[PDB]
Amino acid sequence: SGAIYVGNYRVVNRHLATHNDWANLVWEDSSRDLLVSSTTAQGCDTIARCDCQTGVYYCSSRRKHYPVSFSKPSLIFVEASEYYPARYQSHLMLAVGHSEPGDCGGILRCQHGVVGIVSTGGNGLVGFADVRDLLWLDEE
Numbered sequence: 165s166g167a168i169y170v171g172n173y174r175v176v177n178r179h180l181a182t183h184n185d186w187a188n189l190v191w192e193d194s195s196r197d198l199l200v201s202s203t204t205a206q207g208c209d210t211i212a213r214c215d216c217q218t219g220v221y222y223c224s225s226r227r228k229h230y231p232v233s234f235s236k237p238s239l240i241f242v243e244a245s246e247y248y249p250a251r252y253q254s255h256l257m258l259a260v261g262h263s264e265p266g267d268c269g270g271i272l273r274c275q276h277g278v279v280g281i282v283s284t285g286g287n288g289l290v291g292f293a294d295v296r297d298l299l300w301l302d303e304e
């Protein structure tokens with residue numbers, strides 16, 4: 165589990181969105197595994213607007229942050245899970261790192277801010293849904 169709280173937005177994995185998220189929906193995209201809802205309170209996370217391809221992510225199944233090198237956002241074929249059939253996921257970045265299904269929502273960041281959230285994984289890989297192209301997260 166996990167979310168990004170920037171401005172009056174909450175960014176979560178689409179497959180983990182709650183009824184309150186769907187009832188206060190701003191934007192969703194199944195191909196990216198992302199959903200954004202509106203919030204009453206202002207958040208403290210800042211979105212990275214950069215070209216970093218090294219950063220750190222939070223792994224809840226280890227209670228630890230790990231440094232990683234990650235690929236550029238791409239269209240990758242992801243295997244079936246209980247939330248999606250096997251399909252192409254867009255704007256996905258892969259790294260070598262431990263992960264388990266419940267680690268989705270953990271933040272990947274660099275010195276510039278939040279880069280994305282954990283969305284896929286297995287066998288020593290972890291995949292992150294990028295958010296750096298969603299420029300509208302920075303404005304009302």
Ligand SMILES: C[C@@H](Cc1cocn1)NC(=O)c1nn(C)c2ccccc12
Pocket residue numbers: 179197242243244245246247248253263264265266267268282283284285286287290291
């Ligand atoms: C919950 C789904 C979401 C999903 C996105 O694309 C299709 N399904 N993801 C997973 O199944 C999953 N995510 N991580 C971090 C893993 C690590 C090890 C094994 C499985 C996973």
Ligand SMILES: [Zn+2]
Pocket residue numbers: 212213214215216274275276277
């Ligand atoms: Zn950066």
